[PDB]
Symmetry: C2
Subunit: 253 residues, 2 copies
């Protein structure tokens, strides 16, 4: 395997591409819109980041103009999943597809000219003072369930939740897992969970568009997830002191 | 493994390419020009044919303008070997290289517009009548040794030899081996051995150029190797009745 979600390189003259296999990961979500279980939406960013790094020879720091079109239904048929990457002058594009018919699950762009970004800081103090306001782990997910979202325990990283004024700070505990994942499945799913909590009924349980995704620091331990905001959302993964490790800007359902 | 000599696909945006690994094949030759053992020259055609088929999505029938520049010395350093394939309007080109410095072992072209070729026939009768003229297996290779060529028993497929007028017909027995090899190592090495026998001292123990290589039939069992001919050579692999299964034209030392 090239990566926990990428089994091998199947590139050819026609296009650069890799074979995706998430059968044996324990990661699924369910929504009120679907009878069948699904592979979490946003973990596809890790698929693109891993594929792009291998195809480009350098790390992938920034992904832009992400588009999610279909959920990864997990059934018995087992539709083989592949990612196609196309270089161009701006950078590169990527398509995560069914191999049988090339139909798109999600698409996006990759920044290939690596540039050092200085990360920001979320001042965490206002959320920390309301210790009584904290929603416990069990209640937090019961509410997402009442909004129509549930997930495997392997994706339940939220320990407690503070929500005020259309803003939410989640306390998360990452799960040590395969070395290969830069973006851990439970961490990036906490990002999606935070949005569903703010959006509530306004959640489409499919993020149609995401303008930017920047990965400032994948070695520091993620501790918090902060989300805010015109149904457009910005999300941040933070270290123990608020330091921004990853940013998702302009998520729109 | 993608093939007995190809372990995986390592293509990227810069070029289509595969990783070669022949460490654990039992196949080596020695020449008077080299202290070290070598991987047989002509088995690289199988590397190109296998890589080209995978890169193009269709069989490889014809290889043209083959150029051999360096022997594959087998040492302890273990230089990782790769094949680069470059598509173009005529067809495609291929380079078999050291991965560390991209230095070429051999190069050639691939025909990608597959066309049905009708194979020819070598009339075998004249060589069959001289049963007394047959050189036995042991004597045949003792003579190649006296010309400065020896090889592992895994490449000793010649059973006996008939030579007249600068022409040679070898009786060969293929060795059942890994399914993946279309061109078996001992079969194509018999081709080279036949040439060394005709060329003798005129052998350079490195085939600098080969104009054409056509593979008409890789399922029928190869039985004979016929070679002839201005130190340019033409060689043929034949079925039990002379039917041409593979042609190497214009081999030049």
């Amino acid at each position: 395997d090239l990566h926990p979600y990428i089994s091998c390189n199947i590139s050819d003259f026609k296009a650069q591409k890799f074979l995706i296999n998430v059968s044996d990961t324990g990661l699924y979500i369910k929504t009120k819109y679907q009878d069948r279980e699904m592979f979490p939406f946003l973990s596809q960013i890790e698929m693109a980041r891993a594929a792009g790094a291998m195809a480009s020879g350098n790390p992938i720091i920034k992904l832009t103009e992400l588009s999610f079109r279909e959920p990864m239904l997990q059934s018995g048929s087992n539709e083989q999943i592949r990612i196609v990457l196309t270089p161009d002058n701006q950078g590169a594009s990527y398509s995560i597809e069914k191999q049988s018919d090339s139909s798109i699950y999600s698409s996006g762009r990759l920044e290939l000219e690596g540039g050092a970004y200085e990360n920001g800081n979320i001042h965490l103090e206002p959320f920390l003072s309301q210790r009584a306001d904290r929603i416990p782990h069990e209640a937090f997910y019961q509410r997402l369930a009442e909004f129509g979202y549930s997930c495997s325990d392997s994706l339940k990283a939220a320990e407690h939740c503070v929500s005020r004024n259309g803003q939410v700070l989640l306390k998360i505990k990452a799960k040590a897992g395969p070395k290969g994942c830069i973006i851990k499945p439970e961490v990036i799913e906490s990002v999606y969970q935070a949005v569903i909590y703010l959006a509530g009924e306004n959640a489409g349980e499919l993020p149609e568009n995401i303008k930017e995704c920047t990965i400032f620091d994948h070695e520091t331990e993620p501790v918090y997830v902060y989300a805010e905001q015109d149904s457009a959302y910005d999300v941040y993964v933070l270290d123990n002191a608020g330091g921004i490790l990853m940013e998702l800007s302009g998520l729109v359902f």
